[PDB]
Scaffold this active site. Sequence first.
Site, PDB file in Angstrom:
ATOM      1  N   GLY A 244       0.798   0.049   3.129  1.00 53.31           N
ATOM      2  CA  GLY A 244       1.800  -0.986   2.913  1.00 53.31           C
ATOM      3  C   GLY A 244       1.666  -1.626   1.552  1.00 53.31           C
ATOM      4  N   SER A 245       1.866  -2.936   1.522  1.00 56.59           N
ATOM      5  CA  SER A 245       1.941  -3.678   0.268  1.00 56.59           C
ATOM      6  C   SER A 245       0.636  -3.655  -0.534  1.00 56.59           C
ATOM      7  CB  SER A 245       2.339  -5.112   0.566  1.00 56.59           C
ATOM      8  OG  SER A 245       3.602  -5.132   1.204  1.00 56.59           O
ATOM      9  N   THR A 246      -0.509  -3.322   0.092  1.00 53.42           N
ATOM     10  CA  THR A 246      -1.728  -3.257  -0.699  1.00 53.42           C
ATOM     11  C   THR A 246      -1.772  -2.025  -1.631  1.00 53.42           C
ATOM     12  OG1 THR A 246      -2.931  -2.088   1.040  1.00 53.42           O
ATOM     13  CG2 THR A 246      -2.916  -4.445   1.120  1.00 53.42           C
TER      14      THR A 246
END
Length: 492
Positions: A244-246
Site C-alpha cells: 500500500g501507501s508505504t
Amino acid sequence: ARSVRHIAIPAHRGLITDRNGEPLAVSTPVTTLWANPKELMTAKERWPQLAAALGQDTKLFADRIEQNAEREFIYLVRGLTPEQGEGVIALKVPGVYSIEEFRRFYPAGEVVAHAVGFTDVDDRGREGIELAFDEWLAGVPGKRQVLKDRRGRVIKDVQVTKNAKPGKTLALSIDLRLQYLAHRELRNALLENGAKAGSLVIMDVKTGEILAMTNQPTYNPNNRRNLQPAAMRNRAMIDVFEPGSTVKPFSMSAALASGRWKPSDIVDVYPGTLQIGRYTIRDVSRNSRQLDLTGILIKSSNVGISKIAFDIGAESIYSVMQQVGLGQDTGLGFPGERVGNLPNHRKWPKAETATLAYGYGLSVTAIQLAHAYAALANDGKSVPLSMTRVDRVPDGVQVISPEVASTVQGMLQQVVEAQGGVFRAQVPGYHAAGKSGTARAYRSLFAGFAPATDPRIAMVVVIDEPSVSAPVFSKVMAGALRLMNVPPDNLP
Ligand SMILES: *C(=O)[C@@H](NC(=O)Cc1cccs1)[C@@H]1NC(C(=O)O)=C(/C=C/c2ccc([N+](=O)[O-])cc2[N+](=O)[O-])CS1
C-alpha cells in the site's frame, strides 16, 4: 555368540546467542532410558515396579514388552532430569539401560521463538535459525564399536571409531534487549487496539543486521504440548501482504530521478478521484486541488501519486522497487520464507501503473519492506540482510542515487513533523521519518527510520484486523535508539 553393531555418540549441539553473547538456545544434558526386551523377559517379576516408576499402566507396559519380545532395543522414556533417570536406574532392573543425551533449552522462550526456532526430539533443527544453520550447530556424531551377546549384552568397545565433534556457536544479529522491547510493545498494541496478529522488524541500516524480529501471536518453544500452527507462524518472513501507501516513497524516488520532478512541483488532485475505464482511483480525503510532492504524501493522495506515475511510467517505479528488493529473494535462507510478488508488464496499462504507484498489485514480506526502507535511510545504499552478527560488513549496492535518497528522507521527515505526527509517530528527542499505510477489516502498516540526520535504525510495524502503528513505531524506536545510546539529534 558374538555380533558387532554400532551405537552413535550424540554431538553437543552449538550454543545460539544474540549480538551480545546472551544464550538463546542451549544444549541441556538429559537422560533417555531404553531396554533390551530379551533382557526384560527374564525379569517379568520386575515389570510392575518399572511401569509404576514410569507412570505407565502395569498391563499396558507388559503388553508393550511382550509384543517386542524378539526385538533388541526399545525407548522407555526420553529426556528425564538426570536425577529423575538416576532414580529409575536405582531400581536396577535387568535390561533397563540409559544413554546421556542433549535436549535444547530456550531461555528467552516466547520472546524470540520465531527467530530462533526449535528442535525436534532428535535434537535436529525443525524451525527458524535452528533449522537454517543446522549444519553449523549440529556437529559430527561419533560412533561406538562394541560386542553383542545372546540377547543384547554389551561386552566392550574395540576402538573409538569416531570421536564426536561438537557443533559451533552461533551469535545472532538480534539484540535481545531490543527484541524484548519490540516483543512487549507489539503485544500491548495487539491488545490495546483489539487486533489478531502482528509483526515488527528492526534493521540496522548500516550493517544489514536484523536487530529484532517479533510476531504475535507467539508460543513458548520450551512448552510445545498443544501445537497451535498459527502461533508458530513467523509472519515477518512468511506473510506476504500488499504494502500500500508505504511504497509511495519509492514511487517518489523514481519521480525525483526521472529529471522531471522536484519536491516543490505541483500536481492537481481535484476532485480527489480519477478514472481509467471502469477503474476509479479514490483519495481518502478529497478537499484538495494543487499539492506539491511532499503534500501528496502528507495528504496521502493516491490520485497525486498515480498522476506522477503516468508522467514517468510504471517501468521506472518497478525498477526502483526491484532494486530495493521488493518481491525478490532476500537470501536469508530461512525456512519457508516467501519471495512475494512484483508484477512485470512489457506494456503497463494505466490502471496497473496507478495501483503499483500506491502499493497495490504487489506483495511483500515485512523483512523486505524493512530492507527497502534501510536502503532509503542509508543514503540509497543497500547493505545485504543478515540474521547473524556482522563484524565485517559486506559492500552495499547503490540502488537509489544519494541526492534523491536524501531528498526522499526530507519529505518523509516532513511527513512525520507537519501531519502524521502530534497524535502519534514522533520519536521524542530524535528527528524521525516514515510513511503510514492502510491495507484491507484492514491491516495497519508503518515503516520508517531514525534519526533523520545520521540514520541508524529502520523499523516496520504490521498489525492485522484491528478494532495505529505510528505509536508502536514511535515507542519502540525511542527505546531502541536509547538502548543503542544514539545521541539525540533534535537540538537548539
Ligand atoms: C494507502 O494505503 C492509502 N489507502 C488506500 O488507498 C486504501 C484504503 C484503506 C482504507 C481506506 S482507503 C492511503 N493511506 C492511508 C494511511 O496513510 O494510513 C489511509 C488512511 C485512512 C484511514 C483508514 C482507517 C481509518 N479508521 O479509523 O479506521 C481512518 C483513516 N483515516 O484517517 O481517514 C488510507 S489512504
